[PDB]
Amino acid sequence: TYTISIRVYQTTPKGFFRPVERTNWKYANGGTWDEVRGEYVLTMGGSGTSGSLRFVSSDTDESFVATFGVHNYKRWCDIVTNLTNEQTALVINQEYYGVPIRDQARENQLTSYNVANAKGRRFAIEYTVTEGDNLKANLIIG
Amino acid sequence: TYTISIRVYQTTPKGFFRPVERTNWKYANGGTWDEVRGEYVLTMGGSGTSGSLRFVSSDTDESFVATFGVHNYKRWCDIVTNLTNEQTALVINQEYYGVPIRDQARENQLTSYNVANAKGRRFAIEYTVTEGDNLKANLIIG
Amino acid sequence: TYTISIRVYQTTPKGFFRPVERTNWKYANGGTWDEVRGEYVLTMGGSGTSGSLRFVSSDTDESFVATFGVHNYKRWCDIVTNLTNEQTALVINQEYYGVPIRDQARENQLTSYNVANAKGRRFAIEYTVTEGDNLKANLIIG
Amino acid sequence: TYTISIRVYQTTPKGFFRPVERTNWKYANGGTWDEVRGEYVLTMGGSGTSGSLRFVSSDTDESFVATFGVHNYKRWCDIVTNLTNEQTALVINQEYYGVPIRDQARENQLTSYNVANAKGRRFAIEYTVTEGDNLKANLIIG
Ligand SMILES: [C]C(=O)[N][C]1[C](O[C]2O[C]([C][O])[C]([O])[C]([O])[C]2[O])[C]([O])[C]([C][O])O2[C]1O2[C][C]([N])C([O])=O
Ligand SMILES: [C]C(=O)[N][C]1[C](O[C]2O[C]([C][O])[C]([O])[C]([O])[C]2[O])[C]([O])[C]([C][O])O2[C]1O2[C][C]([N])C([O])=O
Ligand SMILES: [C]C(=O)[N][C]1[C](O[C]2O[C]([C][O])[C]([O])[C]([O])[C]2[O])[C]([O])[C]([C][O])O2[C]1O2[C][C]([N])C([O])=O
Ligand SMILES: [C]C(=O)[N][C]1[C](O[C]2O[C]([C][O])[C]([O])[C]([O])[C]2[O])[C]([O])[C]([C][O])O2[C]1O2[C][C]([N])C([O])=O
Numbered sequence: 001t002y003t004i005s006i007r008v009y010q011t012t013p014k015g016f017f018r019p020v021e022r023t024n025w026k027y028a029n030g031g032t033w034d035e036v037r038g039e040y041v042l043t044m045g046g047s048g049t050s051g052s053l054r055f056v057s058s059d060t061d062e063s064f065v066a067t068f069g070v071h072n073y074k075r076w077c078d079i080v081t082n083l084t085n086e087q088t089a090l091v092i093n094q095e096y097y098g099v100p101i102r103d104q105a106r107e108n109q110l111t112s113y114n115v116a117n118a119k120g121r122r123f124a125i126e127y128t129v130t131e132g133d134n135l136k137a138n139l140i141i142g
Numbered sequence: 143t144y145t146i147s148i149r150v151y152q153t154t155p156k157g158f159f160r161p162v163e164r165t166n167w168k169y170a171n172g173g174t175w176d177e178v179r180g181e182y183v184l185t186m187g188g189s190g191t192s193g194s195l196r197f198v199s200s201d202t203d204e205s206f207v208a209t210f211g212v213h214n215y216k217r218w219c220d221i222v223t224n225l226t227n228e229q230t231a232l233v234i235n236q237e238y239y240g241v242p243i244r245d246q247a248r249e250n251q252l253t254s255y256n257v258a259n260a261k262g263r264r265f266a267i268e269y270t271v272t273e274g275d276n277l278k279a280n281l282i283i284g
Numbered sequence: 285t286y287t288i289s290i291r292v293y294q295t296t297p298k299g300f301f302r303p304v305e306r307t308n309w310k311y312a313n314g315g316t317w318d319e320v321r322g323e324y325v326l327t328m329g330g331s332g333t334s335g336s337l338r339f340v341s342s343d344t345d346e347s348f349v350a351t352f353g354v355h356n357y358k359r360w361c362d363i364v365t366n367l368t369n370e371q372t373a374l375v376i377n378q379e380y381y382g383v384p385i386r387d388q389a390r391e392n393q394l395t396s397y398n399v400a401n402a403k404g405r406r407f408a409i410e411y412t413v414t415e416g417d418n419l420k421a422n423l424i425i426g
Numbered sequence: 427t428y429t430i431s432i433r434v435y436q437t438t439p440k441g442f443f444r445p446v447e448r449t450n451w452k453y454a455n456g457g458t459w460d461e462v463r464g465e466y467v468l469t470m471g472g473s474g475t476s477g478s479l480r481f482v483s484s485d486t487d488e489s490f491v492a493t494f495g496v497h498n499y500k501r502w503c504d505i506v507t508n509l510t511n512e513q514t515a516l517v518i519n520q521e522y523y524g525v526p527i528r529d530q531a532r533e534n535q536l537t538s539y540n541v542a543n544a545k546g547r548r549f550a551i552e553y554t555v556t557e558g559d560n561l562k563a564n565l566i567i568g
């Protein structure tokens with residue numbers, strides 16, 4: 001059993017991102033999302049699956065999907081932004097298991113990743129605990 | 143714009159169901175899940191999409207996925223229980239748009255539905271507001 | 285360090301109680317309230333303090349304050365209902381340290397307590413784990 | 427009826443502040459705290475009362491209480507930090523109605539306030555809507 005506990009940091013008062021969706025991929029006996037002591041906790045039944053969080057800022061027409069998982073016993077993460085209205089977390093989460101560019105992101109097994117949207121705002125995931133079964137990460141909104 | 147506001151009633155202190163997943167289907171410009179005054183609010187861009195909530199009782203090995211949406215301008219609902227580990231809300235939500243046994247449930251446009259798991263526990267959805275833009279439902283865990 | 289983890293059960297779809305307030309008394313190095321896996325967790329720095337939760341049903345003009353603590357190394361609980369508009373949880377929590385009838389409730393060190401409001405609805409606290417530093421309780425709304 | 431809707435911005439991934447307490451003062455027929463679309467909403471019956479939020483960073487031994495309300499039909503705010511274990515939100519909220527050093531802060535009817543703790547971390551409240559029934563504020567953690 002793995003857990004990934006996520007702390008969300010919203011660094012600028014320009015815009016307001018709110019949680020809108022949390023999904024679990026079906027591999028490795030699935031997983032769950034819990035809220036624990038102000039953090040988002042993804043629990044997974046083994047190595048080889050993942051979960052996604054979507055955040056939306058309706059003030060500024062911005063959004064992103066942040067995905068966290070374990071691939072071949074190493075943690076991974078990705079962020080997708082510039083989302084179409086069809087790109088919910090349900091959609092994005094699944095694409096990491098068949099879409100070459102998404103597959104690659106997962107295979108990279110990154111301890112940190114950042115990307116910016118077309119509006120110039122950057123988002124980042126930073127794993128603070130990178131080993132073991134109780135992983136920890138910061139999700140930083142620029 | 144449609145909203146479905148859901149009040150959850152957990153009625154029996156045997157086991158404990160906790161929220162573990164909330165998904166949005168990609169049709170009709172997608173949608174969002176918000177927590178509002180103790181209720182779950184599914185917001186959708188138009189008719190033809192849906193969202194799912196999964197609840198799990200770890201203590202009793204029980205779970206279900208409750209799905210809510212609008213089909214041909216009428217509200218619908220369904221509950222799936224006796225879940226395998228592979229049947230996350232991400233999986234179940236998607237099945238309502240291609241899997242015949244799920245398609246037909248959506249097409250039924252039900253104002254109420256109830257089902258039992260293998261242990262005999264009943265789960266119910268009852269829409270209290272069945273018309274207009276802002277729909278309301280009770281999710282009752284037996 | 286003590287924890288009291290509380291599972292809330294709302295047993296009837298008549299009315300809807302929502303959380304509106306959570307307070308910590310100042311004795312025994314204070315305490316905190318956390319949301320953990322769908323439960324309300326009161327953490328306290330020792331024996332001799334408590335915390336309160338207030339729930340309101342605006343549909344039916346009903347409310348109550350449920351208080352949980354440890355007195356002389358034994359758990360206690362109480363419920364106050366038929367609240368005046370001045371009886372917030374901030375007020376009620378404090379009254380267990382100076383008001384004779386409230387003092388008595390605390391001194392009783394009950395593993396279970398129930399009371400009904402003037403409208404005929406009963407509320408109950410039931411400790412499922414009654415010993416140790418990780419106590420557990422059901423808050424049952426009739 | 428007044429509302430104050432609060433957006434929380436945690437801006438620095440050093441330490442992690444989590445919500446631990448939310449209180450309502452008893453004047454003006456009291457009030458409630460609700461979570462609405464990722465925001466904290468304080469609702470009050472009329473002018474002359476307030477509510478407090480406490481946040482704690484366990485990893486860095488930091489904490490603060492942020493208080494919001496309406497005094498003589500104008501919004502007010504304050505932040506207290508460098509807290510002892512005995513300074514819960516229940517304690518601090520009440521002090522604004524009898525303790526001169528707190529009374530004067532309420533009477534100031536501030537649209538913005540900022541303060542630093544002993545470690546040099548700044549905390550700020552800025553009202554973005556300063557007039558009418560439905561007030562809005564940012565709570566910024568430095
Ligand atoms: C161990 C790991 O991680 N692996 C992985 C996987 O996961 C898996 O899946 C399966 C089905 O297919 C099941 O579910 C199990 O349980 C799990 O574990 C997958 O995910 C993949 C993607 O697709 O990836 C990974 O792997 C790689 C390869 N295939 C090998 O094996 O090596
Ligand atoms: C109107 C309605 O409701 N319709 C429906 C639909 O939805 C849709 O989808 C599309 C794609 O395909 C888009 O997204 C839009 O936007 C929407 O609206 C669908 O969902 C279906 C299922 O699949 O169902 C319904 O319909 C009926 C028929 N099929 C038609 O199409 O018309
Ligand atoms: C141990 C116990 O529990 N005790 C108690 C108390 O608590 C206390 O308090 C103090 C001040 O006063 C401090 O804070 C400390 O820390 C604590 O611990 C109190 O609370 C009381 C009520 O008032 O009760 C109890 O006790 C009894 C008597 N006093 C004896 O001691 O025994
Ligand atoms: C109008 C206003 O805001 N006022 C105020 C007050 O509030 C009040 O309170 C009372 C008792 O005392 C009752 O609760 C009512 O309802 C209300 O409204 C108070 O709070 C104060 C503080 O303590 O402050 C304000 O005011 C001024 C003067 N002091 C008078 O009284 O007028």
Ligand SMILES: CC(=O)N[C@@H]1[C@@H](O)[C@H](O)[C@@H](CO)O[C@@H]1O
Pocket residue numbers: 078079080081082101102105115116117
């Ligand atoms: C702007 C944007 O969202 N780019 C994403 C990138 O972050 C992600 O790593 C990749 C694979 O999923 O898909 C897109 O290229």
Ligand SMILES: CC(=O)N[C@@H]1[C@@H](O)[C@H](O)[C@@H](CO)O[C@@H]1O
Pocket residue numbers: 362363364365366385386389399400401
């Ligand atoms: C109807 C009602 O709320 N009664 C309460 C009772 O439950 C509580 O035990 C006592 C001491 O706090 O105060 C009141 O009598």
